[PDB]
Every structure is written in C-alpha cells, then in structure tokens.
Amino acid sequence: TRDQNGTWEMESNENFEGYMKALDIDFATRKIAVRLTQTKVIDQDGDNFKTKTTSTFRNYDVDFTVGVEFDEYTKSLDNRHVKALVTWEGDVLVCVQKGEKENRGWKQWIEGDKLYLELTCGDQVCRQVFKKK
Numbered sequence: 001t002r003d004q005n006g007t008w009e010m011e012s013n014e015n016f017e018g019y020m021k022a023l024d025i026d027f028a029t030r031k032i033a034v035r036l037t038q039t040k041v042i043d044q045d046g047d048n049f050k051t052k053t054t055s056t057f058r059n060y061d062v063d064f065t066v067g068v069e070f071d072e073y074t075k076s077l078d079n080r081h082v083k084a085l086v087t088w089e090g091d092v093l094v095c096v097q098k099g100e101k102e103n104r105g106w107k108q109w110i111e112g113d114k115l116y117l118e119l120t121c122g123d124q125v126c127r128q129v130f131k132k133k
C-alpha cells in the first residue's frame with residue numbers, strides 16, 4: 001500500500017551513526033542523536049506530504065509534492081541545500097537528494113502495520129523501522 005499516513009513510533013534503528021557520520025554531523029550531536037527513539041508523523045493527501053520527525057533532542061520537518069523537485073534545506077541536520085525529488089517506484093517512496101554528497105537519498109515503504117525507512121549517504125546505509133500508533 002501507498003498509504004503512509006499516521007503517527008509512527010520507532011522500533012528499530014540500524015547504523016544511524018554511520019549515516020550521520022557520512023553527513024558530517026558533528027560529534028556531540030551524533031553522540032546524543034544516536035541514543036534517541038524517533039517518532040514520525042505523516043500527513044499525506046494525494047501527492048502532498050507533510051512530515052515531522054521528532055525526538056527529545058531535535059526535530060526535522062519536510063514537506064513535498066511527489067513528482068515535484070524542490071530545494072531542501074537540511075536545517076538541524078547537516079545544514080545543506082539539496083535538490084530533492086520524491087517519486088513512487090511501485091509502492092516504495094523514493095527520494096534522491098542531489099548535491100554535495102554522492103548517493104544521498106532515502107526510500108520509505110509500508111509493510112503491514114510498519115513503516116520502513118532506508119537512509120543513504122555515500123557508502124553508508126541506515127535502516128529504520130516504525131510501528132503505527
């Protein structure tokens with residue numbers, strides 16, 4: 001299914017530190033953020049996504065329209081501009097973030113009651129799993 005609406009609570013987080021290191025997130029921030037359980041809130045209406053990813057330390061919001069390239073400013077992350085494009089490959093939501101970093105993007109998809117997220121940068125892959133609230 002393509003319905004990713006809802007509040008999603010993290011069950012699993014694999015190699016988040018490697019992903020952050022590839023983004024050149026500073027040590028203090030990495031070492032706190034790797035500790036944390038995340039929540040994702042997604043509002044999806046047709047093409048239009050509004051997403052909020054939260055932790056006790058820092059949040060990240062990004063909104064986009066599927067199939068419409070946009071300038072993403074990764075504030076609170078590595079603070080870079082990328083040309084972001086989110087599309088559907090089957091039922092997998094695929095984002096490519098064009099810019100300074102090679103192989104940068106993510107893939108997000110539903111399996112049953114869970115949301116899977118794969119974050120890539122350079123040669124690093126972070127895999128996350130969230131359960132629907």
Ligand SMILES: CC1=C(/C=C/C(C)=C/C=C/C(C)=C/CO)C(C)(C)CCC1
Pocket residue numbers: 020025033038040051053054055057058059060062076077106108117119
């Ligand atoms: C790195 C980093 C963080 C960012 C998490 C990420 C990478 C969010 C990705 C959002 C996406 C892919 C939306 C579709 O779900 C948080 C704020 C948790 C803590 C501070 C350091």
